[PDB]
Amino acid sequence: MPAVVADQYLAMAKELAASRFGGFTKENIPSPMAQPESYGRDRLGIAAVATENPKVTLRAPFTSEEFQGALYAIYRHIFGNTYVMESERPTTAESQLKDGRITVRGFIRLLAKSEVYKSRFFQKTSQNRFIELSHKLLLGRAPYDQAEISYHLDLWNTQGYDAEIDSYVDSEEYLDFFGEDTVPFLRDFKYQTGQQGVGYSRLLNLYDGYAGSDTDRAQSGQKARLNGTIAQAEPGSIERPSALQDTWKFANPNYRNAKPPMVKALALEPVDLLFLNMAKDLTSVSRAEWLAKSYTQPSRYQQTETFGQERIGAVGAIETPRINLRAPFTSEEFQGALYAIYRHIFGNTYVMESERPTTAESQLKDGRITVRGFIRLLAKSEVYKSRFFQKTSQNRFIELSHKLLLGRAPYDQAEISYHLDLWNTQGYDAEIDSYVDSEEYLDFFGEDTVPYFRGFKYQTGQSAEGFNRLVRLYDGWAGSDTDRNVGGQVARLTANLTRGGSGLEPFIVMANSRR
Amino acid sequence: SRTVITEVIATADSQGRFLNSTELQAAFGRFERAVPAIEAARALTKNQDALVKGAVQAVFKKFPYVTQPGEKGYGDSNQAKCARDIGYYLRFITYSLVASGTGPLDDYVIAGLREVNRAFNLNPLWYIEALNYIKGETGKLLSGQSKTEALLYIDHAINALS
Amino acid sequence: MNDVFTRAIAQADLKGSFLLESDLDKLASFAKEGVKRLDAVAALTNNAPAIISDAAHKLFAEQQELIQPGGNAYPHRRMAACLRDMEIILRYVSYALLAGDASVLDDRCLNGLRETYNALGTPTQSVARAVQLMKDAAMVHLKSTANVTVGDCSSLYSEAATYFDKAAASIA
Amino acid sequence: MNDVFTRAIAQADLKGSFLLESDLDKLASFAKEGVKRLDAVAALTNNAPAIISDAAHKLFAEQQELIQPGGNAYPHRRMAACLRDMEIILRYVSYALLAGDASVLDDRCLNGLRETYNALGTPTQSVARAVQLMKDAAMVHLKSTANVTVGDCSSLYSEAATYFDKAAASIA
Ligand SMILES: CCC1=C(C)/C(=C/C2=NC(=C\c3[nH]c(/C=C4\NC(=O)[C@H](C)[C@H]4CC)c(C)c3CCC(=O)O)/C(CCC(=O)O)=C2C)NC1=O
Ligand SMILES: CCC1=C(C)/C(=C/C2=NC(=C\c3[nH]c(/C=C4\NC(=O)[C@H](C)[C@H]4CC)c(C)c3CCC(=O)O)/C(CCC(=O)O)=C2C)NC1=O
Ligand SMILES: CCC1=C(C)/C(=C/C2=NC(=C\c3[nH]c(/C=C4\NC(=O)[C@H](C)[C@H]4CC)c(C)c3CCC(=O)O)/C(CCC(=O)O)=C2C)NC1=O
Ligand SMILES: CCC1=C(C)/C(=C/C2=NC(=C\c3[nH]c(/C=C4\NC(=O)[C@H](C)[C@H]4CC)c(C)c3CCC(=O)O)/C(CCC(=O)O)=C2C)NC1=O
Ligand SMILES: CCC1=C(C)/C(=C/C2=NC(=C\c3[nH]c(/C=C4\NC(=O)[C@H](C)[C@H]4CC)c(C)c3CCC(=O)O)/C(CCC(=O)O)=C2C)NC1=O
Ligand SMILES: CCC1=C(C)/C(=C/C2=NC(=C\c3[nH]c(/C=C4\NC(=O)[C@H](C)[C@H]4CC)c(C)c3CCC(=O)O)/C(CCC(=O)O)=C2C)NC1=O
Numbered sequence A: 001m002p003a004v005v006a007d008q009y010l011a012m013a014k015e016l017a018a019s020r021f022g023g024f025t026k027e028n029i030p031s032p033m034a035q036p037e038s039y040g041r042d043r044l045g046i047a048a049v050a051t052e053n054p055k056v057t058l059r060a061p062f063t064s065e066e067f068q069g070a071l072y073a074i075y076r077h078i079f080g081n082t083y084v085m086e087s088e089r090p091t092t093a094e095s096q097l098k099d100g101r102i103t104v105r106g107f108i109r110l111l112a113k114s115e116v117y118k119s120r121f122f123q124k125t126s127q128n129r130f131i132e133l134s135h136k137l138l139l140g141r142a143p144y145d146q147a148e149i150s151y152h153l154d155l156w157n158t159q160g161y162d163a164e165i166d167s168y169v170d171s172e173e174y175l176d177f178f179g180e181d182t183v184p185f186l187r188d189f190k191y192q193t194g195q196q197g198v199g200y201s202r203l204l205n206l207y208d209g210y211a212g213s214d215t216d217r218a219q220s221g222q223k224a225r226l227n228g229t230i231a232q233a234e235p236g237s238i239e240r241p242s243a244l245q246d247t248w249k250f251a252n253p254n255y256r257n258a259k260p261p262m263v264k265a266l267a268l269e270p271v272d273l274l275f276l277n278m279a280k281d282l283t284s285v286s287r288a289e290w291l292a293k294s295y296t297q298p299s300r301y302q303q304t305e306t307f308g309q310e311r312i313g314a315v316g317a318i319e320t321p322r323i324n325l326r327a328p329f330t331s332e333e334f335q336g337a338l339y340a341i342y343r344h345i346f347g348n349t350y351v352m353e354s355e356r357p358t359t360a361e362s363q364l365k366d367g368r369i370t371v372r373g374f375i376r377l378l379a380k381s382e383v384y385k386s387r388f389f390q391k392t393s394q395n396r397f398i399e400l401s402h403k404l405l406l407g408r409a410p411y412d413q414a415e416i417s418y419h420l421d422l423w424n425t426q427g428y429d430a431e432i433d434s435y436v437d438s439e440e441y442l443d444f445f446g447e448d449t450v451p452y453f454r455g456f457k458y459q460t461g462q463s464a465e466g467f468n469r470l471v472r473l474y475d476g477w478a479g480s481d482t483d484r485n486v487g488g489q490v491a492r493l494t495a496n497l498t499r500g501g502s503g504l505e506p507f508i509v510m511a512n513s514r515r
Numbered sequence B: 001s002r003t004v005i006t007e008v009i010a011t012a013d014s015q016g017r018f019l020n021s022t023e024l025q026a027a028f029g030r031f032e033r034a035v036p037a038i039e040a041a042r043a044l045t046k047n048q049d050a051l052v053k054g055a056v057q058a059v060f061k062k063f064p065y066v067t068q069p070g071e072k073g074y075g076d077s078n079q080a081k082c083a084r085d086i087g088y089y090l091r092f093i094t095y096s097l098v099a100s101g102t103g104p105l106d107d108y109v110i111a112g113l114r115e116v117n118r119a120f121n122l123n124p125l126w127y128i129e130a131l132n133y134i135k136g137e138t139g140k141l142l143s144g145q146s147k148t149e150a151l152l153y154i155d156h157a158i159n160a161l162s
Numbered sequence C, D: 001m002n003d004v005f006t007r008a009i010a011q012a013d014l015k016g017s018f019l020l021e022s023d024l025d026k027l028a029s030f031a032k033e034g035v036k037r038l039d040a041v042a043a044l045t046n047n048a049p050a051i052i053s054d055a056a057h058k059l060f061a062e063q064q065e066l067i068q069p070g071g072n073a074y075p076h077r078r079m080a081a082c083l084r085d086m087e088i089i090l091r092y093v094s095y096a097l098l099a100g101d102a103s104v105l106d107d108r109c110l111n112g113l114r115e116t117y118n119a120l121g122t123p124t125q126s127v128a129r130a131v132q133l134m135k136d137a138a139m140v141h142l143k144s145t146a147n148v149t150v151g152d153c154s155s156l157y158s159e160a161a162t163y164f165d166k167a168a169a170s171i172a
């Protein structure tokens, strides 16, 4: 199979995938919000004053170019961005600065007390505007609270203008950020320790761009622009100049914002807001806890653990303790074992004190026989014979002996035939010995444990009707196998045993087809 | 389920006799210990979500090899089932604490535990680690005797898993 | 078989839920009032022969037909079985009073008992009458404040009454 | 900036009346729970690095577009700005928790912060999400009963949640 694509495009694809580390993967994708590192400061137009322009510092020893540049920066900051004509330049003040008689801080104080500063920012202004400008130009920030305006207005009214300028320049905040050597700069465009949330917006409101200025020579004049926002404790306006709507227009900060649908989804039937609820459950939250809560939702089958055993009525027959009787046994263990043995081997039939076998109990107490030999004796005893053999058919006797001595129901008709022939040819004792000498008995009860009802659990080799035949044979905890019932002691499983089942299964198969 | 009172009644009934001094003294012990056990269950119920999340995280920290692609610990379904299992264990531990017997655990969790874990290839060591975590935070969550009962039941679960 | 605590746990498991604060409070209250329950159970246990003898005398005074030739308690065997039945029912009622749940009765005492009596021919109205007589005989021993700290135990009397009623209702 | 006491004082002053007996009882109850309040503030202050690291991990796992090339938290500078903002807002939440009043948070932190994030082109919704994650981590740390005397503190938990939610709603 030849080249499916021309080599030029393969080269173009390879070089496009090479210029990116890892090629094209799902994790190294570009961000859909396409913001350069300089996005914010560039769209705001504050790149120069915030990052690009260096901090101008002037110590007492300095050369000519440092001095000239420092004065350029000082005049471009302190005097707004307003042009300061040559007739206004202070020569004695900068002679004092050059000599080292005053620092940059003292020079700033002299400049703010000069009539350039007053004429621009004081004499044609309200005091609110003067305070705004003074904060911007002398502290590098905007007023944070109305308390500052009240404080500065009272300070000017009482002590006059120079004390106000001193409070600006003798403040611990001025000395923290500018000390004595460096020119003030707009400092709220980066987060400092004592900033407040409104400072950024308010300074950005006071800053008119690089080519803007704080001029009194506007046609509207010199007007306060934060006089209302500071009293309401509002933020400031973040509307930047018009020259900047051409910067980084392909950035998408609001990428996570959802576009609304043209019409809202409505559910006419179960109410109107169910699709919104389904949507919120699906999307708003993580899938993990969604699945976890779905897994623990209560089932519609409201079935306890004992459900199913309560239905067939065999909770007790299953939760009875398994009695084992060793050779050295106490009196209470012995009496309890006798009680259990009589409750099981005699089909929950009342046995009277005159019918209890005291010699067999003595033999068991000594150790001459085991639980197994005791059970064999009891099954050969006249109590057992009279209640389960002498007024019954052999079918009833066989099913009942299976139930009482093996704890299970017969599995097929071969058991009936086998045991009937056994009794007929070898008598009743051999028939009992088959049950007690059986491999089943020895596997499950084995010489020391009392028989119990096994067939309420699956037994290997069971015929799936043995469970049902035991449920039929079992009559409940308060049920017995008495021969004193009104009709007699009668067989229960004859038709089921011989037939192998109900005889309705082919029709169940037919029904599970079409209908 | 197999509790103090139910064992008492089962023994009395299996011997076909009333409740005597021994059985009533056992029930009395149950009724006294109910207070620490019930409020340990209360404290365990309150902090169930944190306990389950921490137990899952501990399983993953001890068994980092389950969570990468291709095996049992991978996927939201598997991790959700992990949270569900640890919540099951905690639920039945609190049940056993309230009932003052390992009947809830023995009947709902432990019975069939090994066959089920084998069939679905769930390592018992994961749950052992989760329960050891649960033990660590129940040490600090609970004080005095309540700590003692909650530890007995957590350790019964652990022993059954091991 | 269940006690009150296991009944609550089983109901909470059907919800996949832990036990609520309110349900835990109910269980704590059950436990705190457990000494009274123990005294009631001791009252039933210790006075069992008196309760059964009183009930038997009253039952065979009211219903003379049970002890005539042809009655359901005529020969010694049938009377012995009757007394055993009464003892068993009282024993299980005491089990239920200790447990706090009628579950032991329904799972064991009254499991196949109505069908047992129906197949035997026992008049279940008379069995329920014997159970009511036992309830009357047992209330006087439950309420006896001699030799026990006096307090409010009407709830235990009502609970024991309801267990006796549940037995009688299942029979008849 | 004022606390609960000065809030009550301001409401009393506008009416022009003394503080009522109910108000004085309320403030005294506040003072009596102040010890638990200090515990909660210390829980916030001690575990602040863990809180913010966790909230940052969850925020950038949930919103990967912030940390990939072009994203608003992408270069080290903007990542540092993001983590610093989380620091700051947690700080002011703890301040408000101590004062018993959100006035410090609203006045000094939250007020013009939406405008700042609009001007800078920062996703305000992502900042609100970060405040929420940082809320959940802080709540995990407050409820820690280790090394602190045990007792009910639900009022403090709800109050801190209100402060975190107010921060989130103001930023967004
Ligand atoms: C970032 C670089 C930068 C720029 C570009 C800049 C421009 C600038 N020009 C200004 C004034 C001015 N600009 C002009 C020039 C115009 N009038 C004439 O008719 C001409 C047609 C035209 C010039 C070709 C005039 C006359 C003024 C004075 C306005 C006045 O005094 O009322 C001012 C006000 C400053 C003040 O008066 O205190 C600024 C800030 N400033 C800067 O820092
Ligand atoms: C230099 C030119 C100039 C002036 C004069 C000026 C007025 C001015 N008045 C102010 C407040 C105020 N002004 C007043 C006076 C009024 N309230 C009473 O009802 C009277 C009816 C009435 C006076 C007769 C009051 C009471 C305040 C304080 C209000 C407040 O704190 O909210 C403030 C804010 C500082 C503060 O809170 O104390 C200014 C700046 N601003 C200026 O730039
Ligand atoms: C769950 C525990 C349990 C119970 C409750 C129980 C009751 C019970 N009573 C029985 C017999 C009996 N029960 C009675 C009692 C009745 N006679 C009437 O006169 C009286 C009004 C009434 C008693 C109040 C009698 C007379 C018999 C024997 C019937 C007979 O011999 O023909 C039987 C048949 C067993 C046998 O006959 O040997 C059972 C199963 N057995 C149990 O294992
Ligand atoms: C102790 C009282 C008692 C008796 C007597 C009894 C009879 C009895 N006869 C049986 C079978 C049988 N019975 C007969 C007898 C018939 N053969 C011809 O049809 C003749 C017309 C007729 C005899 C004259 C036959 C042939 C079988 C075998 C049935 C078979 O294998 O399908 C079976 C089934 C088990 C077996 O195969 O041995 C029983 C239970 N059951 C009892 O409980
Ligand atoms: C030799 C042929 C044979 C079979 C197959 C057989 C099955 C059998 N399944 C049983 C119980 C059960 N069987 C199931 C299985 C069902 N429930 C689940 O939800 C599934 C939907 C479904 C299996 C795919 C369950 C859950 C039980 C427990 C019921 C209970 O006791 O509550 C029982 C009752 C005894 C026991 O719990 O072990 C039998 C006898 N018996 C037989 O003699
Ligand atoms: C060995 C078996 C055993 C028993 C029998 C037993 C009973 C028992 N009864 C008690 C007192 C009590 N017993 C009763 C019950 C009585 N109040 C009315 O008079 C009724 C007639 C009757 C109950 C129906 C009451 C009300 C108390 C006081 C405790 C309380 O009110 O909370 C106490 C606590 C002693 C105390 O008051 O500090 C116990 C332990 N505890 C045991 O370990």
Ligand SMILES: CCC1=C(C)/C(=C/C2=NC(=C\c3[nH]c(/C=C4\NC(=O)[C@H](C)[C@H]4CC)c(C)c3CCC(=O)O)/C(CCC(=O)O)=C2C)NC1=O
Binding pocket: D057, D060, D067, D073, D074, D075, D076, D079
């Ligand atoms: C523009 C320049 C830029 C750099 C350089 C940068 C580094 C960087 N790597 C990170 C993740 C990471 N990077 C590593 C690197 C380690 N992995 C190990 O195999 C190595 C021994 C070692 C690397 C030498 C690790 C462990 C993390 C995860 C840290 C965590 O969030 O727990 C993170 C945390 C943000 C995230 O969750 O992805 C940053 C900020 N980010 C940037 O925007």
Ligand SMILES: CCC1=C(C)/C(=C/C2=NC(=C\c3[nH]c(/C=C4\NC(=O)[C@H](C)[C@H]4CC)c(C)c3CCC(=O)O)/C(CCC(=O)O)=C2C)NC1=O
Binding pocket: A037, A038, A039, A040, A041, A189, A190, A191, A195, A196, A197, A198, A199, A200, D066, D072, D073, D077, D078, D079, D081, D082, D083, D085, D086, D088, D089, D108, D109, D110, D113, D116, D120, D122, D123, D126, D127, D130
């Ligand atoms: C005292 C109260 C106060 C606060 C809180 C405050 C925050 C603040 N965050 C800023 C920038 C920033 N803030 C963030 C934070 C965002 N990045 C991700 O999207 C996150 C969702 C989110 C943080 C959880 C980022 C990335 C920047 C840099 C954007 C830029 O400089 O262009 C800035 C601009 C100055 C600077 O870059 O340092 C301020 C003033 N300012 C205040 O005066």
Ligand SMILES: CCC1=C(C)/C(=C/C2=NC(=C\c3[nH]c(/C=C4\NC(=O)[C@H](C)[C@H]4CC)c(C)c3CCC(=O)O)/C(CCC(=O)O)=C2C)NC1=O
Binding pocket: D032, D033, D035, D036, D037, D038, D039, D040, D042, D142, D143, D144, D145, D148, D149, D150, D151, D152, D153, D156
């Ligand atoms: C040096 C700064 C300082 C600290 C650190 C401080 C903690 C502190 N917490 C105390 C009590 C307490 N502390 C708590 C708070 C806890 N309740 C729950 O466990 C919560 C997890 C948690 C708070 C959310 C409670 C409920 C009390 C007891 C009730 C009370 O005295 O108010 C006490 C009184 C003595 C004691 O019982 O331990 C102190 C001194 N107090 C201080 O002045």
